Amino acid sequence: VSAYLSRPSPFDLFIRKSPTITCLVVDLAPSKGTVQLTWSRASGKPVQHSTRKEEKQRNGTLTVTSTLPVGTRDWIEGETYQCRVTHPHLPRALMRSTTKTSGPRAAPEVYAFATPEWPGSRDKRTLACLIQNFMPEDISVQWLHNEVQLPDARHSTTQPRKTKGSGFFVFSRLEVTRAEWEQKDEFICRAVHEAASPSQTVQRAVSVN
Amino acid sequence: VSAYLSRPSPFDLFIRKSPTITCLVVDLAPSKGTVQLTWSRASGKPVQHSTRKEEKQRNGTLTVTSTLPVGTRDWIEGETYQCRVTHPHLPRALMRSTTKTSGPRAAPEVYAFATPEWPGSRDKRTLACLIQNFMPEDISVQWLHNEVQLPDARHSTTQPRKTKGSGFFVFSRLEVTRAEWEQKDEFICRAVHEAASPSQTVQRAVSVN
Numbered sequence: 187v188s189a190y191l192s193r194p195s196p197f198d199l200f201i202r203k204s205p206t207i208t209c210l211v212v213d214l215a216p217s218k219g220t221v222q223l224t225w226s227r228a229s230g231k232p233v234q235h236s237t238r239k240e241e242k243q244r245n246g247t248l249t250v251t252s253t254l255p256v257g258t259r260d261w262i263e264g265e266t267y268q269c270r271v272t273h274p275h276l277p278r279a280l281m282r283s284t285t286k287t288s289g290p291r292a293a294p295e296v297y298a299f300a301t302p303e304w305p306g307s308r309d310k311r312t313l314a315c316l317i318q319n320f321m322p323e324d325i326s327v328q329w330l331h332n333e334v335q336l337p338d339a340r341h342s343t344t345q346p347r348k349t350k351g352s353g354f355f356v357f358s359r360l361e362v363t364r365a366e367w368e369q370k371d372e373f374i375c376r377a378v379h380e381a382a383s384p385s386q387t388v389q390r391a392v393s394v395n
Numbered sequence: 396v397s398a399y400l401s402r403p404s405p406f407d408l409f410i411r412k413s414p415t416i417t418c419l420v421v422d423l424a425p426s427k428g429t430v431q432l433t434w435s436r437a438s439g440k441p442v443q444h445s446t447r448k449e450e451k452q453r454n455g456t457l458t459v460t461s462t463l464p465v466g467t468r469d470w471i472e473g474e475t476y477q478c479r480v481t482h483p484h485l486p487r488a489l490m491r492s493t494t495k496t497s498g499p500r501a502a503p504e505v506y507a508f509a510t511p512e513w514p515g516s517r518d519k520r521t522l523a524c525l526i527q528n529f530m531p532e533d534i535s536v537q538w539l540h541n542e543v544q545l546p547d548a549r550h551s552t553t554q555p556r557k558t559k560g561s562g563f564f565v566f567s568r569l570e571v572t573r574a575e576w577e578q579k580d581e582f583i584c585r586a587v588h589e590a591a592s593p594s595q596t597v598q599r600a601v602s603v604n
């Protein structure tokens with residue numbers, strides 16, 4: 187029986203200003219009892235109503251995830267949120283807590299690229315974004331075009347991996363069509379990160395030329 | 396407990412022409428008694444002598460691995476190798492099999508990029524490589540300078556993800572130093588793939604400039 191507690195996405199925190207936290211509970215061998223997920227703050231202030239979802243998996247195990255809406259100001263000013271997990275036939279109560287980092291920070295470096303022509307695909311182009319040397323690993327990536335954010339499904343971002351020096355890197359990939367760049371030849375890759383200043387974002391544009 | 400069985404890397408398979416497979420056994424509860432890893436083929440032909448290895452991790456976990464060398468021709472022609480795992484404290488043994496993935500083939504497209512100078516850090520640059528539109532997902536990636544292969548610890552390659560089409564993509568990152576590019580400002584990103592004509596390889600060169 188595992189219990190994980192994740193922090194809000196930077197996008198939800200700093201752009202949409204509606205953060206949430208998710209308490210994920212994985213139970214290898216469940217008795218199908220009533221696992222209770224109670225939320226609480228360190229200050230004693232009340233918590234908003236949380237969503238809950240249970241799902242049986244193919245490998246014979248139940249996952250319970252509860253998502254708790256959190257206040258923007260509250261998180262940014264350093265509130266500690268706790269997920270208490272309880273089950274009748276379980277030795278003790280698992281307790282996971284989360285809060286905004288007070289350890290080392292580093293803004294990300296962003297670099298945007300556009301692939302050259304490849305024989306037999308002159309209408310297609312792949313744009314790629316390197317984002318590196320940032321910490322913590324919490325980061326959100328968006329692609330913009332005509333000053334407008336494209337749907338998330340359009341692009342693909344890799345999992346945060348450690349760099350050799352310090353911090354993390356991720357790559358983001360976005361396929362684009364001739365129509366797009368001929369309409370306007372400028373695509374922005376934007377990273378959202380708490381260590382970034384002054385507004386928690388760092389973005390870079392690239393063109394197909 | 397959980398067991399994993401990998402396939403041979405394209406490099407070992409096609410370039411060194413001495414492929415091996417590994418049966419990894421992760422034991423979260425190190426109990427007394429020797430764990431058994433027995434090898435076999437689907438055809439029922441003799442397997443070569445394998446290598447057993449044991450080591451305890453920092454998180455109180457035991458890691459036992461057995462590596463079996465396999466034949467080049469044998470693997471390509473579609474042999475299935477098999478690893479039967481037997482722990483002292485378990486009734487039914489765990490079995491894992493591996494074999495050459497079979498589907499349509501596609502050659503990889505390689506693209507290689509160099510970052511511009513980031514404020515402050517002038518004595519180093521990051522090189523990026525995008526390798527996309529290939530299948531199956533198996534692919535080796537290596538960096539070279541002066542026709543000399545750099546150590547694997549120097550670069551970092553992401554796990555193969557699905558593209559919007561029908562192929563897979565992978566990124567690879569390598570930090571270089573001022574002493575290296577001033578000696579010879581050219582770096583090769585080389586990918587080894589089954590469908591990579593003409594000699595199982597595709598590469599592309601890049602410069603810091």
Ligand SMILES: *[C@@H]1O[C@H](CO)[C@@H](O[C@@H]2O[C@H](CO)[C@@H](O[C@@H]3O[C@H](CO[C@H]4O[C@H](CO)[C@@H](O)[C@H](O)[C@@H]4O)[C@@H](O)[C@H](O[C@H]4O[C@H](CO)[C@@H](O)[C@H](O)[C@@H]4O)[C@@H]3O)[C@H](O)[C@H]2NC(C)=O)[C@H](O)[C@H]1NC(C)=O
Nearest residue numbers: 188190191192210212213214243244245246247249345397
């Ligand atoms: C039967 O099958 C189910 C799934 O079908 C298995 O359930 C999975 O269990 C694993 C671990 O037991 C879960 O993995 C954990 O995910 C956490 C959340 O992060 C993931 O999800 C977010 C967003 O969804 C992604 O952004 C992120 O990249 C991850 O993919 C991680 O936090 C967990 O730990 C990892 O991160 C921490 C740092 O916080 C590290 O310290 C850890 O080392 C580790 O890297 C972990 O990865 C997984 O989510 C479960 N899947 C589902 C669908 O719920 C059962 O375990 C399996 N049963 C058996 C017996 O095998």
Ligand SMILES: *[C@@H]1O[C@H](CO)[C@@H](O[C@@H]2O[C@H](CO)[C@@H](O[C@@H]3O[C@H](CO[C@H]4O[C@H](CO)[C@@H](O)[C@H](O)[C@@H]4O)[C@@H](O)[C@H](O[C@H]4O[C@H](CO)[C@@H](O)[C@H](O)[C@@H]4O)[C@@H]3O)[C@H](O)[C@H]2NC(C)=O)[C@H](O)[C@H]1NC(C)=O
Nearest residue numbers: 397399400401417419420421423452453454455456457458
């Ligand atoms: C205590 O700490 C140890 C490490 O010190 C942890 O051991 C690791 O456990 C995880 C989970 O089993 C292992 O991760 C698995 O890796 C497999 C592939 O191995 C890669 O890395 C090795 C390098 O040793 C390479 O040789 C290999 O080629 C790979 O690059 C994956 O196959 C496993 O599953 C993943 O892939 C499959 C696809 O087939 C997916 O289905 C899965 O979803 C998943 O993505 C898995 O990721 C890891 O290998 C172990 N490390 C070591 C050093 O042995 C213990 O787990 C940890 N204890 C606890 C309780 O967490």
